[PDB]
Structure 1
Amino acid sequence: EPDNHVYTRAAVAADAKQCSKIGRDALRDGGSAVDAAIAALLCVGLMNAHSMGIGGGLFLTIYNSTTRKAEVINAREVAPRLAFATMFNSSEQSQKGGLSVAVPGEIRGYELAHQRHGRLPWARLFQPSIQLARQGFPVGKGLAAALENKRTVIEQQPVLCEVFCRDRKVLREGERLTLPQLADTYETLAIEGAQAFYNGSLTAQIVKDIQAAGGIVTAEDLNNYRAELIEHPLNISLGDAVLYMPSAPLSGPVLALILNILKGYNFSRESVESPEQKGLTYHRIVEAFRFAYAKRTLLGDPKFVDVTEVVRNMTSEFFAAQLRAQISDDTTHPISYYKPEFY
């Protein structure tokens, strides 16, 4: 509370106050944006264990003020070598158990970002979080709601109740959470490096855990995982600004489409000052969502599907103009009016 959050030198906006501070401290110790980013992320994996962490994957949009260039680091999970198109027959199937696990890419993401942009030692980035994980912290609001939301699946699950329950009932806001095993793991990662996860001393335990839960990840999946540098991120123009965002497999193209559609209306302060204008503004906004979502189903991993033209269409001004021209100010439309496409 003793802060207006306007900073003259540096800022970290994260979804747990403590992780914002961990990243802020990394910057004060001389670390780069990326160093702070990684450190904050490791903390985020603890404080919001339900949201993200080294069991998952990520993307990073990085701007370098020295080179004045942007880049993206792709480190989203991949399907195991053994995965196939018909492997699930319900949503439930692709949502719980070992089979629903993709090959985590977090740590290789951090590594690759760090090799290219790091200025603090690798171990330095893990230090605060290991500290945090052993120390324990109070459950913040976000995670308490997650716990509440999922109390049935957590409480009936012993391996989850071990860290997430007190007296076999989910932790509540303010109660102390400690993540002992993740602290070990984080420490192993700090010492042994990224390698320990992918082809190293943690690697068999990961396979054993996923597979014992019905999954099909194998060591070879982990050994083969590589994060990817993308030298030229997606970009659009907004006024005299330029936004950088990731291409497929992410929603860069959708967001580019949404915004390119809406920039044509020349929105301003005026657009919300009377409910008449504010009404139409929000209607057009929802219409832009619907038009952009229609084209989304054409998207997939560009390594496996040629979405070159789809993406060029989605981030282009002609295409956007073409869809704005079809938005009715007086009405929304049937799904089919947007021309959803699956080929």
Structure 2
Amino acid sequence: DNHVYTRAAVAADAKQCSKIGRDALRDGGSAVDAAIAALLCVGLMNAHSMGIGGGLFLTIYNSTTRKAEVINAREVAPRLAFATMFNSSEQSQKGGLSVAVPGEIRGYELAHQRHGRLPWARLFQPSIQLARQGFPVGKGLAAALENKRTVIEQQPVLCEVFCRDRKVLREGERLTLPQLADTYETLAIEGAQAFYNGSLTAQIVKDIQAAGGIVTAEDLNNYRAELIEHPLNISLGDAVLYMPSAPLSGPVLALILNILKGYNFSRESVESPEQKGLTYHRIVEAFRFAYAKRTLLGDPKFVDVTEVVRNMTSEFFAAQLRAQISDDTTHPISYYKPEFYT
């Protein structure tokens, strides 16, 4: 194919999951039903990347209302977490202590409640099948599996599904995920509540704590996905761009693009090496200015960022930064005024 479609499209990082999203659309699902169905699949085929143990953000545009919204379903620190809980990168990267409270399923549930057209169980059906039947390991997972071969091969509970004859699966080899298949089935029939306050909850807590974690039933009971009715936007010519604000990187993206829009890039900007080189230099300098301000961002419910974010989405502020970009040189770090306090 060339991947131009008349009516609808799903772009995922595994073919089988794009197809599962497409079939859901074909069966009368909204864009959300499709997204959820495809995401459930990606949690299987790209198990290294994402899944129901993690968290997500959805940016959603409704063509009827012409309104855009964001669903924040990112993990949160457990109630017993504290600033000085880790003393090495090792401690914050491996084991139960490194685990934040998963928001994935609550996020799916809120998105489905607001925009779903298919039954909840229907979104899980093809992934339940896929996880039992198995699938060839794709390019992405294969390379992840190789990158982490040591840690995986020496952890029996991971080797159980990710090894063949005690060696990580290679590209093309069959991966089955039978336990997840059952878990997905429970979720399909009992609903979101099975994870957060239901039949899966005690076992989740037990697994996390047995690995040294501090997530408790209360953490799960209290998790809430959040509807953000007014996401970040910027104006770009005749278009508006909707993206999430802090704690995500919409503000950084907005700043990068507002800086660069003052240069009026076009086809001509990459036509000759003289133009092309200047264009890419300007792009990198915009990255640098945008990342300088990034260090003041954090969860806006805990840190006051309204001013910082206002600056990062302001065109005038962007113009001020653009004017400090030198066409003939990059600069030392201090030149961009990174800030670590206010």
Match in the other structure for 1:92: 90
SS at match of 2:235: strand
Query: Residue deviations 1:33-70, cap 9 Å, x none?
Result: 00000000000000000000000000000000000000
Structure 1 Cα separation of the partners of residues 169 and 276 of structure 2? 42
> Matches of 2:226 and 2:160 in 1, distance apart?
35
Deviation at 1:189, TM superposition (A): 0.2
- Structure 1: segments with no counterpart, 5+ residues: none
Q: Give 1:342 shift.
A: 1.5
Q: CA RMSD in A?
A: 0.5
Deviations 1:251-307 (A, max 9, x none): 000000000011110001011111111101111100001100000011010111111
Deviation by residue 1:153-198 (Cα, 9 ceiling, x = unmatched): 0001100000000000000000000000000000000000000000
What displacement does 1:91 show? 1.2
Q: Residues of 1 paired with 2:218 and 2:339: CA distance?
A: 36
Judge which range, 45-54 or 87-96, deviates more. Answer: 87-96
Give the equivalent residue in structure 2 for 1:237: 235
Separation in structure 1 between the aligned mates of residue 156 and residue 264 of structure 2, nearest angstrom: 55
Identity of aligned residues (%): 100
Secondary structure, counterpart of 1:299 in structure 2: coil
Structure 1 stretch displaced more, 17-26 or 308-317: 308-317
- Cα drift, residue 216 of structure 1: 0.5
Secondary structure in structure 2 of the residue aligned to 1:36: helix
Q: CA offsets, 1:85-130, max 9 Å, x none?
A: 0011111111000010000000000000000000000000000000
Question: For the residues of structure 1 that align with 2:212 and 2:160, how far apart are their CA atoms?
Answer: 21
Compute the displacement of 1:206 (Å).
0.6
Shift of 1:4: 1.2
Paired with 1:211 and 1:110, the residues of 2 have a C-alpha distance of 25
After superposing the two structures, state which structure 1 stretch, 18-27 or 89-98, moved more: 89-98
Q: CA deviation at 1:336?
A: 1.0
Equivalence for 1:225: 223
Query: What CA distance in whole angstroms lies between the structure 2 residues aligned with 1:310 and 1:224?
Result: 30
SS of 2:242's equivalent in the other structure is strand
Report the secondary structure of 1:59's partner residue. strand
Gaps of 5+ in 2: none
Corresponding residue SS for 1:265: coil
- 1:5-34 per-residue CA deviation (whole Å, 9 max, x = no partner) reads 000100000000000000000000000000
1:325 positional shift: 0.7
SS in 2 for 1:15: coil
**Distance in 2 separating the partners of 1:203 and 1:209:** 10
Query: Could you list the per-position Cα deviations for residues 299-338 of structure 1 after superposition, in whole angstroms to 9, with x for gaps in the alignment?
Result: 0101111111111110111110111010111111111111
**Aligned pairs, how many?**
341
Q: TM-score scaled to structure 1, two decimals?
A: 0.99
2:137 is matched with: 139
Q: Under a length normalisation based on structure 2, what TM-score does the superposition of the two structures give?
A: 0.99
